[PDB]
Nucleic acid binder design. Structure first.
Lengths: 315, 122, 111, 110, 111, 111
RNA sequence: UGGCUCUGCCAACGCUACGGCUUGGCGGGCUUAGGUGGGGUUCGGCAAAACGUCGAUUACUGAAAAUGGAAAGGCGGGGCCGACUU
RNA sequence: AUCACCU
């Protein structure tokens, strides 16, 4: 919106937002030590957050890493950021990005692959899901995209507090991690759609479907996508394939042919239930081993809102 | 920022209160629809409905299980007040739906109170 | 014993209309009848939660204070007298709960 | 026993309840609290008689003496005169009858 | 007791006219000022009857709450119902019943 | 200090909340009267806390402060008008938070 | 929220310190978000505006972009006009 | 998805 955006920490801390942030942070968590300790003096704590963010005195409390959780003030500060910072980033997200965008969501992603699998009758498909998206987001070339849109010195500082501008690891477990991961992988969206003039694709954070009406082209696109996201974005590509549309696009929990869409969702349910059980088994320490495992394989099926799902059902 | 620390931070009281605030938020509108008449029972319902928060809150800022059991007794009296508001308040006070809804919310607070009573008893 | 608060709920089912009807005139007594009528469930819901015979004696007290309120609201004069019938068709109901509490007080004093 | 004081206290009540309704609206908190000490001092006897921790009997005497206060307050309340000094003496005859009973009951339980 | 109440009667006799001057506006406060003014001789009479200092300290708390009510009615109650003059004399009378209360605390707390 | 400071800071809670709690419509009567009985009547818990220097009562002062906080949450989440607007909840919560801080420091002191 | 420490009238359970008060009428005033769980994806056109992006935190204004700030233009489709269909 | 709850 007019490039710039050089005055957002004013809107992030504009109560009216720090309350939207509050109601967004508390939504679902109204049973979290964090909400309930915050809810007590909630609007005094929002006025002290309006004040700690307006004055840039805000410090993100240490991530409680079991999935790194935060505080309620922290998730509120992120909800405040990603109420002003999210809509200036999820505006530059090519429509075919489908993660952490309420409008263009999971289902619209599976619908979209199908859509532009139907139209153009794609003869071929590229899945190019990213490896450690969150654990290998440059958190540095991320902040060369969270800085070409923010341009607000103090928002940029709040972003850099809520998410340090140094490392290689967006903390999966944050709303700003969600947003910035979409933004970050939006660089590969803008190496698909902009460069690579690939008009037909879809992405949810790490999963990058790129349905293209020619095979070897989609393998080129992928190599170009991997070379980009490695050299520019330090995102190793865990799995990829250039399959004829017939193998099915294992995108976003579905297997999306032009015509049918066989929900393969099982890894998720297996993991959900596994986490589930582990917790109502007192085995929340081998769950960290399992979690680390599943955070390696089919977490590059962007099932992190599910990881936070099961960060909340169970601990 | 640091959330303004109340003392004796008790999850159960906070949760039970936050979950009981949903009971109030449901039952208070339908106490405040109880006719011009029936208003002393509504005084006492509300004093029972809105005043059960104090019971939970003092229970959380107590270590006394007496106060936890007193919070349970109040929830049971509120569970009663549902019965009364439904049946005995002769106009209506509480529709079976409203009771069916309110009893669900009070049951949620009942669960949290039970868990809270349990965790202290050990 | 939680048929008490469902036998006493028939005291309230009777005596609550015989309380909404004590006019403003006798609205300090109505408030205090309703806090002994309605608020005897509290004493039977505290009871069933501290067998501790004391609370059942304090609910006997609340039934006996309800019996006072019965006999008071009769002698409250004007078209606000709890009809002798109502004092009697409620002292029947309060005596039901008095006998269930007679048993509760028995069953808890005798272990 | 609880039934004795309570019935003799209903003479206090039956006397002081029309008087405590005739206490000016102006003196309405004192009236509502006179009545909540008139009526609802029976509750302190009944508690004292249905139970018997003698603390409950002192609370009964407290209410009787707080009732005596309400007399000696509502008489010489303020401008809207409440209880006449006569009524306070007459009431205090009956409040001293339950005074005697509850007092002798305190003494007998003690 | 007897003398504390007779000295607290003077508080009431001073403060009750002040509590009756509070407008209808702040009628809900005077309810609880008078429930603290008039209602504090329950705690001075319940402390009289019940030698336990729990109800004496409760009596002391009530006197201190009554002193708050002076502060409140003089200022916090927005049309400062009690004037600062009327606090100072009412706090003299509260201090005379606080004298006896502190000296009643004293006479109870001997060992 | 401590009790005197907490109450003077809580005066400012009441100095804000009592006007809010008196504007609450009589529709929300017992809300208004129980808000006030937890507003004004929280000084009672501060008094007892200081009068006793028993940490339980400075915790029950916190429970009154937290019930006071419920009341702002609730008088916000009251629904005929909105009784306490969220600015008045916010400013109240700020004032109660200052009382919470001094009670917290006082709790800490005794703890 | 049966109110009102609230009047005027009126009447009597009454109660009067004889004033009233009370009390009853009778008027009048005051009184979507949240919780909990676990195929429009159609076919076309314009792709002008808008929107996005790159241009650009650029030129520029101003020492300095300093939480000012474009634009032409490229790239999109997300957008649009339509039909159908929803 | 379900639950409340009014437009």
């Amino acid at each position: 919106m007019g490039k710039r955006h050089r005055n957002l920490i004013d809107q992030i801390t504009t109560w009216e937002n720090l309350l939207d942030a509050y109601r967004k942070t508390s939504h679902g968590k109204r049973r979290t030590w964090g909400y309930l300790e915050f809810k007590e003096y909630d609007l005094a704590n929002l006025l002290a957050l309006q004040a700690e963010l307006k004055a840039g005195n805000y410090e993100r409390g240490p991530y409680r890493e079991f999935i790194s959780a935060l505080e309620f003030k922290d998730r509120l500060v992120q909800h405040a950021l990603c109420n002003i910072v999210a809509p200036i980033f999820e505006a530059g997200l090519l429509p075919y990005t489908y993660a952490c965008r309420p409008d263009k969501g999971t289902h619209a992603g599976v619908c979209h692959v199908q859509a532009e699998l139907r139209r153009t009758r794609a003869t071929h498909f590229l899945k190019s899901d990213f490896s450690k998206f969150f654990p290998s987001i440059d958190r540095a070339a991320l902040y060369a995209m969270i800085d070409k849109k923010i341009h607000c010195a103090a928002t940029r500082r709040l972003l850099r507090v809520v998410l340090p501008d140094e490392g290689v690891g967006i903390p999966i477990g944050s709303l700003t991690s969600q947003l910035f991961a979409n933004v970050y992988g939006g660089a590969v969206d803008r190496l698909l759609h902009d460069e690579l003039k690939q008009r037909h694709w879809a992405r949810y954070m790490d999963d990058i479907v790129v349905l293209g009406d020619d095979p070897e082209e989609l393998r080129a696109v992928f190599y170009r996508l991997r070379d980009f996201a490695s050299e520019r974005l330090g995102l190793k590509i865990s799995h990829w394939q250039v399959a004829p549309v017939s193998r099915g696009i294992n995108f976003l929990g579905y297997r999306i042919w032009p015509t049918h869409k066989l929900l393969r969702k099982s890894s998720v349910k297996r993991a959900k239930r596994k986490v589930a059980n582990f917790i109502k088994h007192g085995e929340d320490e081998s769950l960290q081993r399992f979690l680390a495992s599943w955070s390696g394989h089919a977490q590059w099926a962007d099932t992190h809102n599910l990881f936070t799902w099961m960060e909340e059902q169970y601990g | 920022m640091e959330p303004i620390e109340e003392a004796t931070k008790c999850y159960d009281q906070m949760l039970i209160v936050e979950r009981y605030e949903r009971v109030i938020s449901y039952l208070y509108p339908i106490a405040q629809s109880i006719p011009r008449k029936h208003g002393v029972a509504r005084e006492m319902f509300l004093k029972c409905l809105l005043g059960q928060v104090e019971l939970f809150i003092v229970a959380g800022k107590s270590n006394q299980v007496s106060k936890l059991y007193a919070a349970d007794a109040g929830l049971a009296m509120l569970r009663f007040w549902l019965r009364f508001l439904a049946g005995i308040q002769k106009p209506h006070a509480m529709t079976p739906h409203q009771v069916e809804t309110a009893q669900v919310l009070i049951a949620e607070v009942g669960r949290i109170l039970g868990s809270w009573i349990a965790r202290v008893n050990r």
